[PDB]
């Protein structure tokens, strides 16, 4: 039982025929074939069946149909009983179209939930109950503590706390308004519009306030109360008492979407309100009685599920020896491969704890070694996160004296389990395929543990026995051993500064020492850290506390294969000052496997990471879950509790975990995690099922258009799409659910006249929904989402995330470069959603509308001419300025990241002049990993077009005062990102295990060291940037002959 | 240990190469292979010894102050060979105890026929072209083979899923046969005892329908298991074909990277290395 191979309604069939024959197996042994509609509910089918069943022998033996339920086999190989009989036949995921009639047993509500959960996580929860692994069963039970703990924190301050969970405030991370946003106000004031639905008839009433941006929602309500009852003749004392009594009896909500102002932040800190300052948009809020909202809130009821002699390591005086016994098979041609051998190594993150050890060489057809491998490490020196990395390697040497080694299949193993027990006895490990592009012999970054796929080479090992269970020592024993070894090792004589100064005197407070610790901590995380600097950092480890953000580099300077050194490091981290999250997240990547370090990193997140920043880094924080040794850890317990107490976090927590459930390397870890989230998140699971079911209908419908109907015309495919979305099973699923891109938006009835299949080859679906909000006319009357099945969206998702962080860095330094990081969520294997940007067009669409019929070569002024026509008069200067600041930020963003092919097809412009880039998918210059050149000459095609706009149409654009201002924005912005180069290396570093082709090893991330000139000084970097931009110009002598195909007329010059 | 030892012909002098250029040259080589790049100290002077011990390159920074050359303060060496090169003879444990191994295989520039093995002067001036053409052709063959490998992996996994669904489906139809014999037997003995004959054949006829269904499904699993066996073997052969190309493709990538410095004598033009080197 796995997930699903296809998203079709039957095994091997995308669409059931409008009427289908269903085998029914009655309780009396009879078998009845029954023609059912594919959209028939199980209620209907059972009714039709029991009427048809009277025509069959032994019919009087059947009870009433209310005493039976259906059971059948689903495409996930599961024996599913269907208690919820409201479900249509085509949405049962039946393997074969048959149904067995049985009497229902057990708790109906429990079994309905376990299906809803299994459907949402893409994996039947009965598969978890089948696992013999004690760590899996321990995780399922023990993690319920986090669930109960969070549900109590929700229902503690009822009903306000339940409203905070369901509708968390969407605020910026800081209330301080940078001065270029404050001066966009009117003397620090903003005009808001408060709406009220007054009704026997649902009429709408308007009150216009003018308030400071510091107002808490209670004061905005209070000012509304004031303006309302000023005409209502009242005494001053009653009015001052009327405002004071009823200000906390109402709440404020954004008109159009479900974003409430439930908490006491200043008004301008709310993301909707700060945005309206930037865009110069009129805020339209909706005031409702606080009790009218608490009535909508569903009662979240959480139910506990059904499944709810040791010698110390440090007294084992022996060296580590592991036995390589044999391997089942390897797939090599005996005539082309000489011999095979198992290559081993003991690792801590990425660094070996001793010399790698190889087995003897054996022939391929007989992989048996029976060979003890003896390692250069003592058993008590093994760090907590110590692992065994191995692989089967083939060797062939047919040319001269040179020899060729190649890895065949690999596997990693934690040397202690989740209970701190040193592995013992025999152990069989199923190896993994060699990743594409990997040429090394070992793979210490890949996932630990056996391949769940058991139809692979199976390498048998044996570990040593010590006549007792060996446990990693307790933390009390580790700290005590360090106290009498931290002052017994560090503090001898002064001559210990010239042999191995890891034993020097402990008060060197010189500046040459203090200023080197400053330079070391500011180096980028990918820089080489040398052996002296490791000895130097370690020798001054006690002063590193004064510069606490050096902790990453000091941790790479500890000798992890020495228990005495590690123990001292444990005591230093125990009391280490918490540091900012942007630096604690580095300790959570693949480079820091130790539990005590990662604990510290999580304690810094509990202390400084706001829910807004957790939503900002959620991608990376889910990714690093793959690097945790065990299922039960401090990072997941922190992430789980946070998602269980903020539904906006839990939404994207679900989807990002769900998105990777196809990757079998982590599908169990994320499955077990998604289960415990689903089982405890409260009412949101139902909302998610409407979302999950909505996507499956779109995946199945796009599979058809991409496979069966691929050879048909657009008009015939479009005909097929219309008739499919009008079926009752499609209208039920694709209407009335929450947009996965942004759950604040409600998707109502489909506007089928606006839905279409987009022309591109992946068959994207352009989908349009009504907005069921009563104030939908003031926000989005249209919710437009593009569904794409065929392309990997993770790069687009990462690039867009990065772009948003760059925009924050520029805002904090007074640089107003307006980006547009549109929505993009990946919902599974090469399938996801894209938020549409209303009233925006590609540069090509604007030139195709310029123009002059049959242009072949577009004129350079069409874009500037379009902007003049859209922003005539006084609003012209505000539009040109927006185009300038928006073009500048993307220019620097696309250079630092290496996003290529910037032309009129993936650059878009809003009517009001804001420019933004779309379609990334390829960054860090990874097409050139096969050729070598990381910098040639690819002139930006749209220079002259943009220069005309920036220079407001001057004839000689390069000499205008406006272009010189444009250069300074890019120069200032580029250095701004360069000053934060450690964060972006850290973010990409957290994404290594995700499986993106452009992001496989740390050498892939090294591209931004060159574009950010991290090996230079600040002046040499800026000169480097001006040169790279100068090379990337474009001017008169352009070989512009064709724009569709880009043919080039004569002048071949040969 | 000589009369005069020069700076250029030393195997480690690379000039202004970056950190990434060092990663390519120090990989899977034998004891004794090392190189130098520009030091992390912004001043000129530092030379780096890189010894492979247990398959690891240890980085040891030599802090550089004043116009002298050495390891640490004060930089008081007399020749560069004493600094880095002479370690080839005696043990390297005096430098750092983390590299207790010697230096045996030198990748020599003048041992050309050991790496550059073309016979005539006309055949040498193409070994970068021949090695790169062999890389791009065999890389895309392995690319095409790996895409069949991942695809066949998915299809094989789906057949195992469909087989487990057949096993449970067959498990369920088997119960319907054993349930029918429980109920009908108390009646087939009675409908003979009650003279009813239409009812006897209807129960037999209905059990014949169940018979035909189970027989058709078992055959449907049989044809799936037959197809699983053949594709699992087709898979193993796809792996054999890749595992024979993989070690040859690894060397061609390193060989082409080795020959990047060799074509200096047959210098193919600069932008020509945008077509004489690939595209
Ligand atoms: C008006 C303008 C100018 C440039 C270049 C030619 N010029 C400069 C750019 C910045 C700062 C100074 C100059 C400077 O030469 O003065 C430009 N380049 C772009 N790309 C992407 C990043 C890599 C280079 C090519 C994009 C896009 N996408 C873009 O919109 N561009 C817009
Ligand atoms: C963020 C965004 N916004 C848009 N808005 C319009 O396309 N509009 C807006 C209304 C008319 C119509 C137009 N100009 O024609 S498209 C878009 C986007 C982002 C990323 N990729 C794409 C495509 C087209 C490559 C994909 F993936 F959908 F195939 C589009």
CB contact under 8 A, A57 and B202: yes
Q: Cα separation of A253 and A736, whole Å?
A: 21
* Shortest Cα–Cα distance, B239 to chain A (Å): 6
Q: Cα separation of A218 and A244, whole Å?
A: 10
What was the elucidation method?
X-ray
Tell me, yes or no, if B23 comes closer than 8 A to chain A by beta carbon: yes
Q: Chain-centre distance of CA A990, in angstroms?
A: 11
What DSSP character marks residue A765? Answer: E
Burial of A588: CB neighbours in 10 Å, binned 0-12, 13-18, 19+:
buried
Q: Cα separation of A36 and A23, whole Å?
A: 10
CA of A966 to the centre of ligand 1 (A): 10
With CA atoms as reference, report the closest residue to A665 among A514, A448, A881, A429.
Answer: A448
Residues belonging to chain B: 279
The CATH number of residue A94's host domain is 3.10.20.90
Residues A389, A323 within the same domain: yes
Q: Which ligand is nearest to the CA of A973?
A: 1
CB contact under 8 A, B207 and A76: no
Q: Cα separation of A922 and A930, whole Å?
A: 14
Q: Chain-centre distance of CA A585, in angstroms?
A: 15
CA angle centred on A951, ends A950 and A953, rounded to 5° = 110
CA angle centred on B271, ends B266 and B274, rounded to 5° = 95
Is the Cβ–Cβ distance between A465 and A421 less than 8 Å? no
Q: Which ligand is nearest to the CA of A790?
A: 2
Block residue for tokens 């074969």: A96
Domain end (from A61, A90, A105): A105
> Dihedral through CA A930, CA A931, CA A932, CA A936, nearest 10?
-130
What is residue A580's three-state secondary structure? coil
Residues A876, A1024 within the same domain: yes
Q: Cα separation of A242 and A234, whole Å?
A: 9
Helix locations, A104-175, DSSP H: 108-120, 125-129, 134-142, 144-155, 160-166
Helix axes A981-990, A794-812, angle to 10 degrees: 160
CB contact under 8 A, A331 and B243: yes
Residues A998, A1045 within the same domain: yes
- With a CB cutoff of 8 Å and minimum separation 6, the contacts of A973 are A806, A810, A815, A817, A888, A889, A892
Residues A532, A565 within the same domain: yes
Burial of A884: CB neighbours in 10 Å, binned 0-12, 13-18, 19+:
buried
Q: Chain-centre distance of CA A991, in angstroms?
A: 9
Strands A368-378 and A319-327: antiparallel
CA of A1007 to the centre of ligand 1 (A): 19
Tell me, yes or no, if B180 comes closer than 8 A to chain A by beta carbon: yes
Interface test with A, best of B192, B244, B273, B274 (most A CBs within 10 A): B244
Residues A455, A501 within the same domain: no
Task: Decide if A379 is inside a domain.
Answer: yes
Task: Decide if A962 is inside a domain.
Answer: yes
Number of Cβ within 10 Å of residue B208's Cβ equals 11
Q: Cα separation of B76 and B83, whole Å?
A: 10
Q: Which residues pair with residue A339 across a beta bridge?
A: A395
Radius of gyration of chain B (CA): 36
Residues A764, A854 within the same domain: no
Residues A930, A1008 within the same domain: yes
Residues A917, A871 within the same domain: yes
Nearest Cβ partner of B236 from A95, A331, A930?
A331
Block residue for tokens 């060197």: A508
With CA atoms as reference, report the closest residue to A1005 among A586, A625, A557.
Answer: A586
Tell me, yes or no, if A932 comes closer than 8 A to chain B by beta carbon: yes
Residues A857, A997 within the same domain: yes
Ligand 2 atom closest to Cα of residue A822:
1
**H or E segment to which residue A531 belongs:** helix A531-539
* Shortest Cα–Cα distance, B278 to chain A (Å): 7
Q: Cα separation of B13 and B34, whole Å?
A: 10
Tell me, yes or no, if A25 comes closer than 8 A to chain B by beta carbon: yes
Task: Decide if A917 is inside a domain.
Answer: yes
Q: Cis check for the bond before B128: say yes or no (omega within 30 of 0).
A: no
The torsion region of residue A504 among left (phi > 0), alpha (psi -120 to 50) and beta comes to beta
Q: Cα separation of B215 and B256, whole Å?
A: 61
Task: Decide if A371 is inside a domain.
Answer: yes
Name the residue of A796, A835, A836 whose CB sits within 8 Å of the most ligand 2 atoms, as the mutation to test its pocket: A836
Is the Cβ–Cβ distance between A395 and A341 less than 8 Å? yes
Number of Cβ within 10 Å of residue A875's Cβ equals 12
Q: Cα separation of A347 and A593, whole Å?
A: 10
Q: Is the dihedral of CA B232, B237, B241, B247 positive or negative?
A: positive
Domain end (from A53, A87, A105): A105
Task: Decide if A764 is inside a domain.
Answer: yes
Q: Cα separation of A79 and A88, whole Å?
A: 18
Q: Cα separation of A329 and B243, whole Å?
A: 13
Q: Cα separation of B54 and B97, whole Å?
A: 13
Strands A469-471 and A310-312: parallel
Q: CA-CA distances (angstroms) from residue A706 to A534, A711, A721, B92?
A: 56, 9, 12, 63
Task: Decide if A154 is inside a domain.
Answer: no
Touching A: B residues 211-250, CB under 8 Å: 213, 217, 232, 236, 239-240, 243-244, 246-248, 250
Cα separation of the two ends of chain A: 64
Q: Cα separation of A1022 and A972, whole Å?
A: 9
Residues A529, A579 within the same domain: yes
Structure tokens, A7: 């998203």
Q: Cα separation of A973 and A538, whole Å?
A: 36
Block residue for tokens 């040398």: A530
Task: Using an 8 Å CB-CB cutoff, list chain A residues near B55.
Answer: 352, 355-356
The CATH number of residue A494's host domain is 1.25.40.70
Q: List, in order of start, the domains of chain B with CATH numbers.
A: 7-114 (no CATH), 125-277 (1.10.287.1490)
Is the Cβ–Cβ distance between A719 and A683 less than 8 Å? no
Its domain, for residue A208, covers 168-296
Residues A704, A845 within the same domain: no
Q: How many domains is chain A partitioned into structurally?
A: 6
Instruction: List, chain by chain if needed, residues with CB within 6 Å of any ligand 2 atom.
Output: A 758, 760, 764, 786, 788, 822, 834, 836-837, 840-841, 845, 918-919
Q: Taking CB atoms and an 8 Å cut-off, how many pairs form between chains A and B?
A: 169
Q: Which ligand is nearest to the CA of A766?
A: 2
Task: Using an 8 Å CB-CB cutoff, list chain B residues near A527.
Answer: 19, 40
Residues A777, A868 within the same domain: no
Task: Decide if A150 is inside a domain.
Answer: no
Q: CA-CA distances (angstroms) from residue A753 to A762, A764, A786, A918, B193?
A: 21, 16, 15, 26, 68
Block residue for tokens 């003031």: A778
Q: Cα separation of A882 and A876, whole Å?
A: 10
- With a CB cutoff of 8 Å and minimum separation 6, the contacts of A725 are A701, A731, A734, A750, A752, A755
* Shortest Cα–Cα distance, A62 to chain B (Å): 12
> Three-state SS across A61-112?
HCCCHHHCEEEEEECCCCEEEECCCCCEHHHCCECCCEEEEECCCCCHHHHH
Q: Cα separation of A895 and A950, whole Å?
A: 19
Q: What is the resolution of this structure in A?
A: 2.9
Domain end (from A59, A84, A105): A105
Q: Which residues pair with residue A284 across a beta bridge?
A: A193
- With a CB cutoff of 8 Å and minimum separation 6, the contacts of A855 are A847, A1043
> Three-state SS across A430-488?
ECEECCCCCCCCCCCCCCECCCCCCCCCEEEEEECCCCCEEECCCHHHHHHHHHHHHHH
CB contact under 8 A, A29 and B209: no
Task: Decide if A305 is inside a domain.
Answer: no
């Amino acid at each position: 039982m796995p997930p699903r191979p296809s998203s079709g309604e039957l095994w091997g069939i995308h669409l059931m025929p409008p009427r289908i024959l269903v085998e029914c197996l009655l309780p009396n042994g009879m078998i009845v074939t029954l023609e059912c509609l594919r959209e028939a509910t199980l209620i209907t089918i059972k009714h039709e069946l029991f009427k048809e069943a009277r025509k069959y022998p032994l019919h009087q033996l059947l009870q009433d149909e209310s005493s039976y339920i259906f059971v059948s086999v689903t495409q996930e190989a599961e024996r599913e009983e269907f208690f919820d009989e409201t479900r249509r036949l085509c949405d049962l995921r039946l393997f074969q179209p048959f149904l067995k009639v049985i009497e229902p047993v057990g708790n109906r509500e429990e079994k309905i939930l376990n299906r809803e959960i299994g459907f949402a996580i893409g994996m039947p929860v009965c598969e978890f109950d089948m696992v013999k692994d004690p760590e899996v069963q321990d995780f399922r039970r023990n993690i319920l503590n986090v669930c109960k703990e969070a549900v109590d924190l929700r229902d503690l301050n009822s009903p306000h706390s339940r409203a905070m969970y369901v509708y968390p405030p969407n605020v910026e991370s800081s209330p301080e308004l940078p001065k270029h946003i404050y001066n966009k106000l009117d003397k620090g004031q903003i005009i808001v519009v408060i709406w009220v639905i007054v009704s026997p008839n649902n009429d709408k009433q308007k009150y216009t306030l003018k308030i400071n941006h510091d107002c808490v929602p209670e004061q905005v309500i209070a000012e509304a109360i004031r303006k309302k009852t000023r005409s209502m003749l009242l005494s001053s004392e009653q009015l001052k008492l009327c405002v004071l009594e009823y200000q906390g009896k109402y709440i404020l909500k954004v008109c159009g979407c479900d974003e409430y102002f439930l908490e006491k932040y200043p008004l301008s800190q709310y993301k909707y309100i700060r945005s309206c300052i930037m865009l110069g948009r009129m805020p339209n809020l909706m005031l409702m009685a606080k009790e009218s909202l608490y009535s909508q809130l569903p009662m979240d009821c959480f139910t506990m599920p059904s499944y709810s002699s040791t010698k110390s390591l440090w007294v084992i005086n022996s060296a580590l020896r592991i036995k390589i016994l044999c391997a089942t098979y390897v797939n090599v041609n005996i005539r082309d491969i000489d011999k095979i051998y198992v290559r081993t190594g003991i690792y801590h993150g990425g660094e070996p704890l001793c010399d790698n050890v190889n087995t003897q060489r054996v022939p391929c057809s007989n992989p048996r070694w029976n060979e003890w491998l003896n390692y250069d490490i003592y058993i008590p020196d093994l760090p907590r996160a110590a692992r065994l990395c191995l692989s089967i390697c083939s060797v062939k040497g047919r040319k001269g004296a040179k020899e060729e080694h190649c890895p065949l299949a690999w596997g990693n193993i934690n040397l202690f389990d989740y209970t701190d027990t040193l592995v013992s006895g025999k152990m069989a490990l199923n190896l993994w395929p060699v990743p594409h592009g990997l040429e090394d012999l070992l793979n210490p970054i890949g996932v630990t543990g056996s391949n769940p796929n058991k139809e692979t080479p199976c390498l048998e090992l044996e570990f040593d026995w010590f006549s007792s269970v060996v446990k990693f020592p307790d933390m009390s024993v580790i700290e005590e051993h360090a106290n009498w070894s931290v002052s017994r090792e560090a503090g001898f004589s002064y001559s210990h500064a010239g042999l191995s100064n890891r034993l020097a005197r402990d008060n060197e407070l010189r500046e040459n020492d203090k200023e080197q610790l400053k330079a070391i901590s500011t180096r980028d995380p990918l820089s080489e850290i040398t052996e002296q600097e490791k000895d130097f950092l370690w020798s001054h480890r006690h002063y590193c506390v004064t510069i606490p953000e050096i902790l990453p580099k000091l941790l790479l300077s500890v000798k992890w294969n020495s228990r005495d050194e590690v123990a001292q490091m444990y005591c230093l981290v125990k009391d280490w000052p918490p540091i900012k999250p942007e630096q604690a997240m580095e300790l959570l990547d693949c480079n820091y496997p130790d539990p005590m370090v990662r604990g510290f990193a999580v304690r810094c997140l509990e202390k400084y990471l706001t829910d807004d920043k957790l939503s900002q880094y959620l991608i990376q924080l889910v990714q690093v879950l793959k690097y945790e040794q065990y299922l039960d850890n401090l990072l997941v317990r922190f992430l789980l509790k946070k998602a269980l107490t903020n539904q906006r976090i839990g939404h994207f927590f679900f989807w990002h975990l769900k998105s990777e459930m196809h990757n079998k390397t982590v599908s169990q870890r994320f499955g077990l995690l998604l289960e415990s989230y689903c089982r405890a998140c409260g009412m949101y699971l139902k909302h998610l099922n409407r979302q999950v079911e909505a996507m499956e209908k779109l995946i199945n419908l796009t599979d058809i258009l991409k496979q069966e109907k691929k050879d048909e015309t657009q008009k015939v495919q479009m005909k097929f799409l219309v008739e499919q979305m009008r079926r009752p099973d499609f209208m039920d699923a694709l209407q009335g659910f929450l947009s996965p891109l942004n759950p604040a938006h409600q998707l109502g009835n489909l506007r089928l006249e606006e839905c279409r299949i987009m022309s591109s080859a992946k068959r994207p679906l352009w989908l349009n929904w009504e907005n069921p909000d009563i104030m939908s006319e003031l926000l989005f009357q249209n919710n437009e989402i593009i569904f794409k099945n065929g392309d990997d969206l993770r790069q687009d998702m990462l690039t867009l995330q990065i772009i948003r962080i760059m925009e924050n860095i520029w805002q904090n330094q007074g640089l107003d470069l307006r980006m547009l990081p549109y929505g993009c969520l990946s919902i599974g294997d090469c399938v996801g959603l894209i938020e549409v940007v209303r009233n925006s067009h590609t540069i090509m669409q604007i030139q195709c509308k310029g123009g002059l019929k049959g242009a072949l070569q577009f004129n350079s002024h069409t874009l500037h001419q379009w902007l003049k026509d859209k922003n005539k008069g006084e609003i012209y200067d505000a539009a040109i300025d927006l185009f300038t600041r928006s073009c500048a930020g993307y220019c620097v963003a696309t250079f630092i990241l290496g996003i290529g092919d910037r032309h009129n097809s993936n650059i878009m412009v809003k009517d009001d002049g804001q420019l933004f880039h779309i379609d990334f998918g390829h960054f860090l210059d990874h097409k050139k990993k096969k050729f070598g050149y990381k910098r040639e000459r690819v002139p930006f095609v749209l220079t002259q077009d943009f220069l005309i706009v920036i220079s407001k149409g001057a004839q000689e654009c390069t000499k205008t005062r406006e272009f010189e201002r444009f250069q300074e924005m890019c120069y200032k912005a580029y250095l701004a990102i360069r000053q934060h180069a450690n964060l972006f290396i850290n973010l990409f570093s957290m994404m290594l295990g995700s499986g993106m082709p452009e992001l496989q090893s740390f050498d892939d991330i090294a591209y931004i060291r060159k574009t950010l000139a991290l090996d230079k000084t600040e002046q040499e970097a800026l000169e480097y940037f001006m040169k790279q931009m100068n090379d990337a110009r474009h001017g008169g002598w352009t070989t512009k002959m064709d724009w569709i195909f880009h043919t080039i007329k004569q002048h071949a010059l040969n | 240990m000589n009369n005069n030892m020069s700076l250029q012909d030393a195997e480690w002098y690379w000039g202004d190469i970056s950190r990434e250029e060092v990663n390519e040259k120090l990989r899977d080589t034998a004891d004794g292979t090392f190189l130098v790049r520009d030091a992390s100290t912004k001043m000129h002077g530092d030379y780096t010894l890189t010894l492979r011990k247990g398959g690891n390159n240890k980085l040891i920074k030599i802090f550089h102050r004043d116009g002298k050359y050495g390891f640490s303060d004060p930089l008081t060496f007399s020749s560069v060979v004493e600094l880095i090169n002479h370690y080839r003879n005696e043990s390297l444990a005096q430098y750092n105890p983390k590299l207790d191994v010697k230096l045996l295989y030198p990748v020599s520039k003048y041992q050309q026929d050991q790496v550059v093995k073309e016979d005539n002067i006309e055949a040498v001036g193409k070994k970068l072209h021949e090695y790169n053409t062999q890389f791009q052709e065999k890389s895309r063959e392995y690319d095409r083979l790996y895409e069949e490998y991942t695809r066949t992996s998915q299809e094989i996994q789906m057949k195992r899923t469909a087989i487990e669904a057949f096993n449970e489906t067959i498990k369920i139809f088997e119960e319907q046969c054993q349930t029918q014999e429980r109920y009908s037997k108390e009646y087939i003995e009675k409908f003979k005892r009650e003279g009813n004959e239409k009812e006897i054949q209807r129960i037999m006829h209905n059990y014949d329908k169940l018979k035909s269904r189970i027989s058709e499904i078992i055959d449907s699993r049989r044809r799936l298991e037959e197809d699983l066996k053949k594709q699992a073997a087709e898979y193993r052969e796809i792996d054999k074909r890749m595992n024979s190309i993989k070690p040859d493709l690894i060397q061609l990538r390193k060989t082409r990277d080795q020959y990047l410095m060799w074509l200096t004598q047959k210098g193919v033009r600069q932008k020509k290395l945008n077509e004489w080197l690939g595209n």
